[PDB]
Write an enzyme that holds these catalytic residues in place. Structure first.
Site, PDB file in Angstrom:
ATOM      1  N   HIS A 164       0.839  -1.265   0.000  1.00  0.00           N
ATOM      2  CA  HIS A 164       0.000   0.000   0.000  1.00  0.00           C
ATOM      3  C   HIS A 164       0.839   1.265   0.000  1.00  0.00           C
ATOM      4  CE1 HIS A 164      -2.745  -3.045   1.849  1.00  0.00           C
ATOM      5  NE2 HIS A 164      -3.309  -2.658   0.703  1.00  0.00           N
ATOM      6  N   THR A 203      -6.333   6.925   7.216  1.00  0.00           N
ATOM      7  CA  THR A 203      -6.768   7.104   5.844  1.00  0.00           C
ATOM      8  C   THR A 203      -6.753   5.829   5.038  1.00  0.00           C
ATOM      9  OG1 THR A 203      -4.650   7.724   4.891  1.00  0.00           O
ATOM     10  CG2 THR A 203      -6.045   9.526   5.834  1.00  0.00           C
ATOM     11  N   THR A 204      -6.391   4.692   5.669  1.00  0.00           N
ATOM     12  CA  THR A 204      -6.471   3.375   5.053  1.00  0.00           C
ATOM     13  C   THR A 204      -7.248   2.516   6.018  1.00  0.00           C
ATOM     14  OG1 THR A 204      -4.329   2.815   6.091  1.00  0.00           O
ATOM     15  CG2 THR A 204      -4.327   3.455   3.835  1.00  0.00           C
ATOM     16  N   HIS A 260       3.269  11.198   6.170  1.00  0.00           N
ATOM     17  CA  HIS A 260       2.590  10.962   7.411  1.00  0.00           C
ATOM     18  C   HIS A 260       3.547  10.381   8.435  1.00  0.00           C
ATOM     19  CE1 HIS A 260      -1.524  10.697   5.267  1.00  0.00           C
ATOM     20  NE2 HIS A 260      -1.108  11.943   5.471  1.00  0.00           N
ATOM     21  N   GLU A 315      -3.298  13.500   0.193  1.00  0.00           N
ATOM     22  CA  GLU A 315      -4.583  13.082   0.775  1.00  0.00           C
ATOM     23  C   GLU A 315      -5.365  14.325   1.208  1.00  0.00           C
ATOM     24  OE1 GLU A 315      -3.785   9.657   3.394  1.00  0.00           O
ATOM     25  OE2 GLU A 315      -4.514   8.619   1.594  1.00  0.00           O
ATOM     26  N   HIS A 362       5.329   7.120   6.459  1.00  0.00           N
ATOM     27  CA  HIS A 362       5.104   6.670   5.125  1.00  0.00           C
ATOM     28  C   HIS A 362       4.599   7.842   4.292  1.00  0.00           C
ATOM     29  CE1 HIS A 362       1.188   6.391   7.083  1.00  0.00           C
ATOM     30  NE2 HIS A 362       0.734   6.839   5.907  1.00  0.00           N
ATOM     31  N   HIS A 374       2.074   9.079   0.671  1.00  0.00           N
ATOM     32  CA  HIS A 374       1.089   8.853  -0.364  1.00  0.00           C
ATOM     33  C   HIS A 374       1.501   9.717  -1.563  1.00  0.00           C
ATOM     34  CE1 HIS A 374      -1.643   7.071   2.674  1.00  0.00           C
ATOM     35  NE2 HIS A 374      -1.031   7.899   3.457  1.00  0.00           N
TER      36      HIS A 374
HETATM   37 ZN   LIG Z   1      -0.908   7.867   5.482  1.00  0.00          ZN
END
Ligand SMILES: [Zn+2]
Length: 257
Positions: free
Chosen positions: A61, A195-196, A116, A103, A91, A93
């Site tokens: 992911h 957010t996941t 993040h 995001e 991590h 995005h």
């Molecule tokens: Zn994140």
């Protein structure tokens, strides 16, 4: 299982995780004109001098840079927070192109990527217990724009070849996350969620106003990663972002005028 395709992406997550349509989901659009300055907010305290990075993992992911969170070595405090929050991982995005990837959005602007830094509230003892609490996590979000290289990112970029596919890890010791921070710690804050999946409503979000600059070459290397496992059909790890969710009955507060 869940992902970021057509058939398994954000718009499907609610079927397995009904909290996807909840009252405090993230990310959100930050409307800079309606976020009110809150003089009662404190400066953020980011204390990362003793941080101990351990490993970098492609989880299918994103990739996570993991820290030793067995003691108060890298902690976030202050700001909107009560108490002490320990860094567990960071991590990103990012997008398939520079015009999307973040995001959170700012006045509907999408940045090329978003970092993040995830921290858990020590009063709950472990991460798994913290994510069951409405004040369990504090996530520091930092936008990435494409321009000049970020020197402090390059160590991350250059190890990505070794964790190309899902389930690969590599040793990743002695990495200093201070090199990923912008100059200013001015921020917006609001209550939200992971957010996941599982999308738990356990996060105090702290989104920095000032983006960091990364180079095109740096982000290009993120986009060479794979969602798939080794020797599976290659599907580039890009567009691993959830779009903005309804703000509902929340206010976004600004630490600055
Ligand atoms: Zn994140």
């Amino acid at each position: 299982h869940w992902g970021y395709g057509k058939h398994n992406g954000p718009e499907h997550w609610h079927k397995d995780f009904p909290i996807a349509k909840g009252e405090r989901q993230s990310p959100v659009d930050i409307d800079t004109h309606t976020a009110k300055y809150d003089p009662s907010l404190k400066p953020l305290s980011v204390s990362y001098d003793q941080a101990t990075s351990l490993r970098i993992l492609n989880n299918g992911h994103a990739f996570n840079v993991e820290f030793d969170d067995s003691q108060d070595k890298a902690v976030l405090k202050g700001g909107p927070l009560d108490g002490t929050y320990r860094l567990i991982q960071f991590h990103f995005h990012w997008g398939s192109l520079d015009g999307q990837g973040s995001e959170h959005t700012v006045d509907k602007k999408k940045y090329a990527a978003e970092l993040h830094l995830v921290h858990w509230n020590t009063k709950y003892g472990d991460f798994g217990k913290a994510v069951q609490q409405p004040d369990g996590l504090a996530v520091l979000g930092i936008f990435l724009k494409v321009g000049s290289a970020k020197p402090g990112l390059q160590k991350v970029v250059d190890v990505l070849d070794s964790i190309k596919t899902k389930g690969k890890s590599a040793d990743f010791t002695n990495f200093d996350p201070r090199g990923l921070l912008p100059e200013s710690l001015d921020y917006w804050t609001y209550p939200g969620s992971l957010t996941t999946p599982p999308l738990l409503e356990c996060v105090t979000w702290i989104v920095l106003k000032e983006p960091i600059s990364v180079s095109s070459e740096q982000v290009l290397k993120f986009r060479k990663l794979n969602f798939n496992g080794e020797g599976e059909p290659e599907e580039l790890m890009v567009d691993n972002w959830r779009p903005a969710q309804p703000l509902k009955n929340r206010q976004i507060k600004a630490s600055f005028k």
